[PDB]
């Protein structure tokens, strides 16, 4: 809107001048990147049973396989994660 | 509350104005031969805008190409021709985001009204003015007030003579 | 984006693979009919070159249809007779490189499987 | 509030505008033979404004590149000739970013009003002025209130006797 | 606040134009012979730019390259030939990157008004300059401003014997 | 505030380059037979610049190879004749990075009015000078300011009779 | 014959916020009257059409 169009001239006006990384943040893009993979993977399964033409069985296992990779990867850090957490919170100080 | 600062506001932007149309007036005219008042019509609406504009890439000579593939095809066997031509072209634009705040208290539209006395010579006869004269006042008068006609101003000036 | 470039070569073989059997159970399937020439892909050349290397319509509204955006080089195979229909399909060669293919399509299916297999045993704990 | 400050801002401006023409009509015309008033239509308007240019890359002789492919295929069997040629293009283009905050109290259109004396020689008769010294009248004003036609700036000299 | 800072330095600008002029005006034309105001365009507009030059590199003289693959083939059996050639080349290009910050308080546009006195001599008769003389006042006048086209300065230099 | 200092280093610099030119118009035309005015548009805008330059490979005589593979096949049956040459080659090239900041205060352009006045002699009439002095006057004026063409530098010095 | 075209645009795009003053005059009515002249007579002289 008009708050839009002020953020991009701000921003190219940054631009032309030019011219804290924080876990909570990257724990998300991870997961956005993990639920990315899996709805490509879920939407290209979805095309192929629909009789797409240009969609082949073969890719579409592949990426189903990988997709569940990519999770699987995302559990086992996790569980990682929470073993760390319920170790160190479980101090006497 | 507010809407009292604005019409002190209007009142002395009309005040301004009419002293200012009274300057140039009295030196030729006299002092009180002449008598003015003037009406503003002013602008305390909060208008915010942004413009962008981009500049036009239809013609090939003014446009700028990041990245282009032409693939051409001719198999020629007007017979068993066959012409195959796929084009892809990724152009960069010129680009204006203009971010515009008009200020509060502007003028919309200004009118004018404006009365003139008679001339008494020395024997004492109220001889009117000439339209030479007059055309002087009106003139004078549109370049006091600012008279513009995208803002729709109107001047009025007459000559009568003043009662007593 | 590791997942994706460590299985990129055998996955896009193995589809390879796929498009060259279509195209030979196409030659297969035009085995008589008269002025047909059999076609055939360079496997290892257009492997190479997709390892090596449409435009859809900006969807800004939330309310417009998707619209659509919409490349291997087809070699002839040489004849190895004259036949009078001008059909230059010679079945003994199709039927070999058939076989051929699909076993190497199998082999391409048993090593990216091998590979999903032990990444996963990896990650299993 | 604000307006109050706006208006001072203007008021100060026109006189200095007025003043200025003054100072060089006095010379020649003569102390208190010259009046002249300004007034001044101002900016007050916030405006902020990013710009970005493309230098064009359609010609073959300004374009800069990067990566180019050009595979090119003549089978010649016009006969059954088949020619074919792909090519791909990647360009680098010239850019120019500007970002600009224009003032604010500006002046958009100045128009002024200048009334000049007649000449009363020892005898005293009130002898009007000249063409040609109107003329350099007109110019000097001109001059000193800084006469502009993009801004649409308005000038009118006018000579009468003043009154008494 | 600000305004009233950008007012003084607009007004000292003018007024040291002003005294260069007069101190070259003054030896020649003589004390109090001379009167001249300046009025100053200025430019309160905060401006940043960023530029970026590509030089061409369509020419193969002058194009650098890093890497290159060029694959010839020629099939010949014009009978039946069969050129192939697939040519590509990774380039790299010459690069310019400008930043500017633009001064607040630059002179957009300089008019300046001059006016001369008449020559009286031992008899006292107010006798006018000459036309070699009205030239050399206004190329001393345009190089005291500092007179540019570019800018679009205006300058008028008129004769006239002052007033008592 | 930083706009007075920048008009202070303006004016120190005019006044040091009429110094110079009068220290040397001083000898010859003598003490006060010579008047002279500096004024100098300077450059207060902050810039940066870095500058890459490539040095071009495409002749074979000067360009650096790291790596360079050439397969020729010629299969000769024209007849059947079948060449093929796949030539891959990396490169090594020169390479300039310049990094400049330009100085705040430069000066753009200088244009410098001088005047000089006549030869009495022991009698006392006003002779002007002559044209070979006129010329040495203006080539010492040219050397004093520094006078350059890229600049577009003006100079202009008349003749004329000092007033008493 | 066979053409398939896909072309995407980048759009001019101007947006204006506005906030209404209160208290802004709708429509204006105004009833003026005059007196008659009476001369150093007496007698109530109407005006003119000019006047």
Redesign the interface.
């Known amino acids: 809107a008009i708050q839009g169009i002020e953020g991009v001239i701000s921003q190219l006006q940054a631009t032309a001048m030019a011219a804290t990384v924080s876990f909570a943040g990257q724990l998300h893009a991870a997961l956005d990147r993990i639920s990315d993979r899996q709805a490509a993977a879920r939407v290209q399964a979805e095309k192929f049973t629909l009789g797409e033409p240009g969609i082949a069985l073969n890719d579409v296992m592949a990426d189903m396989q990988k997709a569940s990779v990519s999770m699987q990867m995302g559990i086992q850090v996790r569980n990682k994660l929470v073993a760390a957490y319920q170790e160190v919170m479980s101090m006497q100080v | 509350d507010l809407?009292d600062?604005?019409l002190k506001?209007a009142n002395?932007?009309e005040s301004?104005?009419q002293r200012?149309i009274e300057?140039?007036l009295?030196?030729?005219?006299?002092?009180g031969?002449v008598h003015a008042q003037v009406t503003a019509q002013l602008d305390?609406?909060?208008?915010?805008?942004?413009?962008?504009?981009?500049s036009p890439n239809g013609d090939?000579?003014?446009?700028?190409?990041?990245?282009?593939?032409?693939?051409?095809?001719?198999?020629?066997?007007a017979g068993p021709r066959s012409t195959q031509r796929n084009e892809?072209s990724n152009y960069?634009?010129?680009?204006?985001?203009?971010?515009?705040?008009?200020?509060?208290?502007?003028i919309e539209r200004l009118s004018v009204a404006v009365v003139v006395n008679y001339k008494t010579l020395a024997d004492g006869k109220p001889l009117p003015l000439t339209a030479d004269?007059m055309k002087?006042i009106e003139?004078?008068t549109?370049?006091?007030?600012?008279?513009?006609d995208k803002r729709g101003d109107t001047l009025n000036v007459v000559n009568?003579p003043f009662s007593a | 984006d590791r997942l994706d470039a460590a299985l990129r070569f055998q996955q896009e073989a193995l589809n390879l693979r796929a498009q060259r059997q279509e195209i030979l159970a196409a030659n297969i399937a035009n085995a008589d009919t008269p002025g047909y020439q059999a076609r055939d892909i360079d496997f290892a050349s257009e492997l190479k070159k997709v390892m090596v290397r449409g435009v859809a319509l900006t969807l800004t509204s939330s309310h417009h249809i998707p619209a659509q955006a919409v490349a291997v080089d087809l070699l002839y195979r040489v004849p190895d007779q004259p036949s009078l229909d001008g059909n230059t399909v010679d079945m003994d060669r199709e039927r070999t490189q058939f076989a051929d293919n699909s076993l190497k399509y199998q082999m391409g299916l048993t090593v990216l499987g091998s590979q999903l297999k032990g990444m996963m045993n990896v990650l299993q704990g």
């Open positions: 809407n600062a604005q506001f002395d932007v301004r104005i200012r300057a140039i009295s030196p030729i005219v006299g002092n031969n305390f609406a909060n208008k915010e805008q942004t413009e962008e504009h981009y090939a000579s003014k446009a700028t190409l990041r990245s282009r593939q032409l693939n051409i095809s001719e198999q020629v066997g892809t960069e634009v010129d680009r204006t985001i203009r971010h515009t705040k008009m200020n509060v208290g502007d004269q002087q003139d004078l549109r370049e006091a007030m600012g008279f513009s009568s």
